[PDB]
Amino acid sequence: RGLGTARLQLVEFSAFVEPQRHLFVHISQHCPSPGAPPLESVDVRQIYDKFPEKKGGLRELYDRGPPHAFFLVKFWADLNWGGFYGVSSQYESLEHMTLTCSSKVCSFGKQVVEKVETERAQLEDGRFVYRLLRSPMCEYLVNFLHKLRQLPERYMMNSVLENFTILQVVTNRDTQELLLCTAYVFEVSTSERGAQHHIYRLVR
Numbered sequence: 001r002g003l004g005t006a007r008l009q010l011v012e013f014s015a016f017v018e019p020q021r022h023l024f025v026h027i028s029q030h031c032p033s034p035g036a037p038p039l040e041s042v043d044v045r046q047i048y049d050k051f052p053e054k055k056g057g058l059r060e061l062y063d064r065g066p067p068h069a070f071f072l073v074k075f076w077a078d079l080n081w082g083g084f085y086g087v088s089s090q091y092e093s094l095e096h097m098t099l100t101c102s103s104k105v106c107s108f109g110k111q112v113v114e115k116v117e118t119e120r121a122q123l124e125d126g127r128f129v130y131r132l133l134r135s136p137m138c139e140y141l142v143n144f145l146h147k148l149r150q151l152p153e154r155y156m157m158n159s160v161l162e163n164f165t166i167l168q169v170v171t172n173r174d175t176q177e178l179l180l181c182t183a184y185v186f187e188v189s190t191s192e193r194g195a196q197h198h199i200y201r202l203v204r
């Protein structure tokens, strides 16, 4: 499938730096069409420890449901490049909604940043689109990225990134319904191979 539900679909996601653009990670679901197949599944239990077991932790979130709203993205990021560091997200749906978008940056399973944004639906092409464009990337991530690009060896970046995760929770602001919950894990790619990603379903 893709990263989305009947109610809300991710359309594009990127994290980038501008002085053109450099993209650290990118999901295009404009992609688009598959030809096949469905998404592989990963047992959400094997990643409880990469996020806080406190309130709003993975286990708590998944317990309430709905379980089909839960995805894991593995990113191989491109760190070969002080400009403007940005994140851009676009969702779409057929219903009119206001979204609450929470991003939780985690280091060794502890939250070091929570970022909460709100985005109202916008009618376009007979569907509703939710554009969170050019949101300044938090300072901790900028500083982290500047240190990460210093490491002399890709495998050392990977070692450092094995304890770094992001949890993104999109809820219907009005109703409090969870719409999408995405866990992100990270390695690095080469400049030659370019950034890449793999989306899974989280199951239990």
Ligand SMILES: c1ccc(COc2ccc3[nH]ccc3c2)cc1
Binding pocket: 015, 016, 024, 025, 077, 087, 103, 137, 141, 145, 166, 168, 184, 186
């Ligand atoms: C390591 C590699 C790439 C990057 C790109 O920076 C971001 C920033 C916000 C994000 N939200 C979901 C993935 C994501 C990525 C950060 C750290």
